[PDB]
Amino acid sequence: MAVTNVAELNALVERVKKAQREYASFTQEQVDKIFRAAALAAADARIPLAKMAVAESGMGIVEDKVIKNHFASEYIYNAYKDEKTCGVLSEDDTFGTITIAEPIGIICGIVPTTNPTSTAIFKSLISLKTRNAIIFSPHPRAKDATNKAADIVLQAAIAAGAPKDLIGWIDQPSVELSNALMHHPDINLILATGGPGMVKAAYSSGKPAIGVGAGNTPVVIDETADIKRAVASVLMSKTFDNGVICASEQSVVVVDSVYDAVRERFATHGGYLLQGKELKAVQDVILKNGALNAAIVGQPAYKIAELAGFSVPENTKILIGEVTVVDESEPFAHEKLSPTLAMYRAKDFEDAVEKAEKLVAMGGIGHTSCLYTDQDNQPARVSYFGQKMKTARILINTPASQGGIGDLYNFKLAPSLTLGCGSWGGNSISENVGPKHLINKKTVAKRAENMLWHKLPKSIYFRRGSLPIALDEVITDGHKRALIVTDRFLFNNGYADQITSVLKAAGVETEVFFEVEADPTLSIVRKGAELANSFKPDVIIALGGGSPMDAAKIMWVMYEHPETHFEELALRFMDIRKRIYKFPKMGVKAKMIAVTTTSGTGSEVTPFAVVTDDATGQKYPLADYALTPDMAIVDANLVMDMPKSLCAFGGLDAVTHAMEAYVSVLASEFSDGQALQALKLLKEYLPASYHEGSKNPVARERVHSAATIAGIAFANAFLGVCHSMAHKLGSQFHIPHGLANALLICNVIRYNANDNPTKQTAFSQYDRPQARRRYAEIADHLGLSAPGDRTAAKIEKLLAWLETLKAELGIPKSIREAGVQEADFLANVDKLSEDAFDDQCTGANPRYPLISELKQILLDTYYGRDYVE
Amino acid sequence: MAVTNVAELNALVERVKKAQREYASFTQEQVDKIFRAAALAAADARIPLAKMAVAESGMGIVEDKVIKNHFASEYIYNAYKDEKTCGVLSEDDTFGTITIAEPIGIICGIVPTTNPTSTAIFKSLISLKTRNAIIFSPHPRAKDATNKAADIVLQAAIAAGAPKDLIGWIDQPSVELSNALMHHPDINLILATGGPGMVKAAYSSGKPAIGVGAGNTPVVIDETADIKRAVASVLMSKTFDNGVICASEQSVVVVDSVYDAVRERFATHGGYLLQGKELKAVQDVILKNGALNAAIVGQPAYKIAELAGFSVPENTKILIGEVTVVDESEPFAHEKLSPTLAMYRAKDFEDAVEKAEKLVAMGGIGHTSCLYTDQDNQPARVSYFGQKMKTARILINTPASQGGIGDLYNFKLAPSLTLGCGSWGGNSISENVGPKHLINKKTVAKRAENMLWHKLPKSIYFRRGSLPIALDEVITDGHKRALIVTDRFLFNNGYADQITSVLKAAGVETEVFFEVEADPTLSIVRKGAELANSFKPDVIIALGGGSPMDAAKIMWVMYEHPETHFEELALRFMDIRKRIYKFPKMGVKAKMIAVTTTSGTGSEVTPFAVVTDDATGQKYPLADYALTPDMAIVDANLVMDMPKSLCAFGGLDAVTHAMEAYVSVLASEFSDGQALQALKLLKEYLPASYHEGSKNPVARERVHSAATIAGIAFANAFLGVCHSMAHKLGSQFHIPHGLANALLICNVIRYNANDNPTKQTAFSQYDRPQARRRYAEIADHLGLSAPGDRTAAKIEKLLAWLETLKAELGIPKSIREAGVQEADFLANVDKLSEDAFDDQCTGANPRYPLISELKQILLDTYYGRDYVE
Ligand SMILES: NC(=O)c1ccc[n+]([C@@H]2O[C@H](COP(=O)([O-])OP(=O)(O)OC[C@H]3O[C@@H](n4cnc5c(N)ncnc54)[C@H](O)[C@@H]3O)[C@@H](O)[C@H]2O)c1
Ligand SMILES: NC(=O)c1ccc[n+]([C@@H]2O[C@H](COP(=O)([O-])OP(=O)(O)OC[C@H]3O[C@@H](n4cnc5c(N)ncnc54)[C@H](O)[C@@H]3O)[C@@H](O)[C@H]2O)c1
Ligand SMILES: NC(=O)c1ccc[n+]([C@@H]2O[C@H](COP(=O)([O-])OP(=O)(O)OC[C@H]3O[C@@H](n4cnc5c(N)ncnc54)[C@H](O)[C@@H]3O)[C@@H](O)[C@H]2O)c1
Ligand SMILES: NC(=O)c1ccc[n+]([C@@H]2O[C@H](COP(=O)([O-])OP(=O)(O)OC[C@H]3O[C@@H](n4cnc5c(N)ncnc54)[C@H](O)[C@@H]3O)[C@@H](O)[C@H]2O)c1
Ligand SMILES: [Fe+3]
Ligand SMILES: [Fe+3]
């Protein structure tokens, strides 16, 4: 039963550990009942413990401890009784979160002599609500009391449905014993108290800790304060337990304006101002051996002077010494737990808090500070006192001894002894301790599918003869200044009068910018914003496709936000809503209506805008749904006179826009029927549009509509990896986009079409690799294989249809065959296989390629081979 | 610039410390901008660091680190960018709370080799948002990378409005150096990572810590799971960085129902089942010297077998060994950071989680666990997996490697590396680390006045001839069974037919209980509830006063809640809403209409109900507003035949009911005008009612109304200390209440009437002692002293009026004169001076008496003296 040896300890802990494991399986009602019985047993025993605390400690006063043994039970209960601390605290079912709050284990309670019983009723009683255990290592001066404070708690818990040794205490303490308890393995936490050396040794143990320092507690009394209650509260805080209590106001800092008044008001109401010889004698007994006399602590005032060598009335509550030094040389400013007090003299407020912060900074860093002022009309002072004072508790118009243990003067403050002083003091709690610190929360995280979107430009218009019907719809009914962006071949050949012809004839002012060439550079973009910033357009228009529709919707940026650094605008990301350079909201200065005369790109719908740096020459595909065209237009009358090449490269980038959008990882049921309806039109009408041309406008139109439909697909289901390398392959060699996508898709399919790949994209919605299947759902949709095929022929037949399609469009079989030299390829292939993996298009490819696996399907194309793996 | 010495460290830290102090004074915009620049600089450098991390670490794979260096910047930013962490977080102005969130200081970042760069971009970047600093102590294998990961962060912050050495790193690390950094004083925290030994030495330093262990991560696959994604996600988690990443699924636990299926599905998709000789050879290289081979970590699978002595395809993602042992003897179950994996065989779910909990309990206690099942239709399994598994993260249908660092598969989970494992593991964080852990919150607590009340029984009726008018008002219009409580003198003398006369004549069933005598005991109460529980009344009535009206409203308790233990019902409290035994809501079975024939008590309004234990004989005044009479009645026709004594003792307890209610600490402006209007009527009409009696019914009525008015006062403004001793003085000697209150009030006034008292009640509303003034506002209200008196004569004149009043009512001058013997007083005076301080009435007396100060004004009354102090 008794504990004065190191083995008795190692036995106790075990018969305790085994209580917890039996106590942890308890419910809320089975412990809500243990919590009351232990709190009553502690309240009804408020007087005796307070007697047993003075007989043994030699300090304190009875009637002021009784407020503590009682506060530590009633004011603890009213607060932590309804705190759900057993199981599920919260359950957000929209998400998949649940907080379950298992306990922590067992604890070591390091008790002081200052508050031996309250600090025990407080920990004992709070460690039962969290379904924990605890073991006390008390102070020799108060071992009999704080251990009689737990038996009065335990013997009332076991009587309420608890085990019989859940709690434990050391009877004959030491260092060899505590240091053997704090370092015990079956312990799981340390709940300490007692100032420096204590916390310096709690954390240093090896276990966690909620140790708690302590020290000075400056209090400031400004001109705009109620010097009456400022003083009573100063005395009601020192004399309370004779200041032995922590946080008590060891030092006031008054401003000259009201010093004399305060000086007297302290005198009349039991204040002896240490004027001369008395003072020195008093600041000589305080500090013994660099520390405060361990015999003066908690003792009444008149009992101070006797040790000093003088005498004062027995009714004196306090001993005040008017001083100026605010450093360590003055022992009259350290953490004297006596009723003594230091009275400083300051010019104004700012001069005080500068002085307070200086003497909290010496012994009481982080603990608490106080202020007395107009709590309602001087909120800036407050704001200036909280932002300047490095204390975890700033107590405005409250006494510290009864506001730091806070449920009396202020609510919303966690009632507690064991007041955290923040890392400033050497403890990482920063708050009044409670049961939510003795607790191991834990979070079950159900798989949540990542949110998706089908976002387009409103006002898509599509048929032959749709320009004037559209401009005169939403543009002219509205804006007044336009900026048509296009290329020369369209400005020269009357593709841009057909649009000004309509704006003119109404009130509008046009200005065309036609210095855009294939693969636009950032130099052309600036030059376009440099113009937009002069013409100040109310709207922006973009013709052709790709180069214009990619230079314009970015010129739309530099016009509304010229501070945009392309280096940050083209930063590769991992998710498009968790973007690190969130695009600015740009639809205010001007809109970005878009027209297209080129089939494939589909840029008229999608956020993508491919441009190159003009310094490194790397195409930086940059993406955000803020640069959607805002009323795209797609008229098939601007395509019927296209050459045979641009038709192929276009309609053949659209194929690889849907192919790697039906198979992508962001694919959905919204973007999977459009991709197919595109891929089914590019099969019935694409060859015709190449051979026949304008002679079959029915086909030249569908292809134009399809290539846009893919946009609806790959605007939401981003591209795959064929573009991540086609952008680089089409830059280091100036190969066109569509021609590059054609020389890879018949070797990229068979890359992604492995159900046992080396990697995978880590997308929640992506259960497992479906690409091999997601590619056969294509063939069966086109009509390649009806009868019961292996799912591997449906692919061979998909490729075959491509090699057949790439044949009857003049597409070469390889790059070598496309105007590239093995000497210039092998050299800068490792460079653009890395710069491909670092593209934003590849973050959606189902297989998450390895640099060592793009290089291979990048050589196998130069030599017209097949990636076999 | 460089750091390979212990002094270079002590210099670095200083030029860092001085950055913080300059960085702490920064605003939100001045740091919201530092946070971006550092996150971009880290994202754009996602590839190289991943290269620099493999060249130097020898482990990992490039394309999987890049997801980390990028997650640690983008997914960190999107989450902690809007987190207010600079100043005021919250401001509840109704209360007086403000959370200001000063920073913590500077930090030591202990980095592993597993995640050298991400763990640096994560800490570096999160320590800038909290306006902190940090210093890294990296792993020798990865010193060049994680230090190149901070310069890429710092040099981008200083370029955004920051100092030039805010961050720091060690180039040539050691133990002598870290151990000298962790123990450095100017440090304020430790942000560690690296498993056991690390955290065992972080906390052991002397500073706080958020160190983070690590270990096994069981994953359970039940019958009702999607074995397809269960597997892909198992591989997508191991092969990811080659399992080197923490939290990865080191062990699966499948149930027989689907084991064979899972066994194959693992095989087809890159799973080599270690069947025979291969297995042993494989579980022989894992653990070297009791620990795992530090060369196998992060290495690919096929590179495992080579060390084992066999070979497998290069495309194998994983190495699986079907085993049964679940203890330490099997090294195939420890925290192997390799792509290896253990496959266990279980009968059913419960048999698995019992097995998982056993192998998390060995090396990975607290870190995280996983489960694959129907996340929607099997919520009990979930509930059973979270309540049973001691892990801070339970991952349902998510892969661990990409769900523990959680913003991808589940949201609402704090994205973080540095995953806390809870005290189970040896760290008191219990949660994924973030910036709110690197932060010192602090709470300004403005003085809030404690809420008060003016709560009475509705339906107070008062005039001559008010019984029948009242009973036939709300009782008969309603209830049907009554229980009149009274004493014999009223039952005998027809005071109780006057009330049944009216109930009868209507449909009601009466039963009278008249075994109540003065100073009722708990035996009489039970005997009354023992009756009420038989008659089952719909209403309760109480006549006379005190004894009945105090035994009935408690018999009202035992009737509606017979489980009430008087020991808890009479427990002294510190506040009446923070009560530790909250009374039950008792107005459902029966009401408690009350009548009174005795003036003083005023119990017909107030919650008080004085009764004695009958064992110790101590009057336990118990109080709660739940036992208010619910339609009190006060008719003056039941008093006009009272004797001369009861008139005095009554009207003279009412005096001390208002006197110590206008001066009390809970006094308010609601209860201060009633107290006076009582105290002004007991002065004009009390003497008359004594001498004349029924001959002056005008006076006999007012006194009856006044004595009730005081009830309105001291029901809300509790009594003082005259009752806390009159209850004991009237019990140890059976002196009547009013006679005791009269022999003390003319010595208690001059007790509370000291403006420099020894103590004070600690009530916020009580600025300072006003009693000396609050007693003179009385005299001036009665008419004792009009002309400009000293405020000390107004008291002498108040007392004089009392000694004069106590004279013309036959009240003796002292107790000695009242039938008490010095031999029996001096003996049991120390006993009832303590049992007075332990009364609930004294908790409202302005002076908070000392036991040594009640004894004195308790002897000074025996000898008819004056308390002088
Ligand atoms: N912040 C609070 O809530 C609070 C409450 C009470 C007291 N205090 C502070 O406590 C201090 C006074 O308490 P004291 O009078 O107990 O001084 P103290 O705490 O030095 O007394 C020593 C206590 O700490 C233990 N202790 C000391 N050094 C130790 C070590 N190296 N290893 C293990 N245990 C060790 C002893 O066993 C004993 O319990 C004052 O500074 C006061 O402000 C603070
Ligand atoms: N997601 C996207 O939005 C996305 C994806 C990939 C590539 N791109 C961009 O698309 C570009 C492709 O360029 P494109 O194929 O869009 O058009 P393009 O701008 O390459 O035009 C190429 C040539 O075709 C000419 N041309 C355009 N329309 C014509 C017409 N109707 N009649 C005759 N000649 C015409 C142009 O004048 C130019 O000389 C790529 O280079 C890249 O910048 C965008
Ligand atoms: N939970 C997480 O956030 C997380 C993430 C990744 C890895 N991990 C864990 O980290 C560990 C990785 O292995 P490691 O690379 O940590 O090897 P290791 O465990 O030897 O780490 C040693 C580290 O300890 C540091 N150190 C400083 N003072 C020390 C002292 N007094 N004693 C010992 N070490 C001291 C060294 O500088 C070195 O960096 C594994 O346990 C892994 O699970 C955890
Ligand atoms: N809850 C409160 O409001 C409150 C406050 C202070 C004290 N008290 C308690 O009230 C009790 C006092 O009871 P009381 O003194 O009010 O009366 P009492 O209950 O002592 O009994 C008074 C006696 O006087 C006689 N009596 C009563 N009414 C009479 C009448 N109308 N005519 C003739 N004789 C009559 C009866 O014999 C009766 O027993 C004490 O226990 C005291 O502690 C209550
Ligand atoms: Fe394309
Ligand atoms: Fe009374």
Residue numbers in the entry:
A (entry chain B), B (entry chain A): 1 to 869
Please give sentences taken from the publication describing this entry:
The bifunctional alcohol–acetaldehyde dehydrogenase enzyme (AdhE) is a key metabolic enzyme of the alcoholic fermentation pathway. AdhE converts acetyl-coenzyme A to acetaldehyde and then to ethanol, in a two-step reaction that is coupled with the oxidation of two NADH molecules into NAD+. Intriguingly, AdhE is capable of oligomerization and forms a filament (identified as spirosome in early studies).
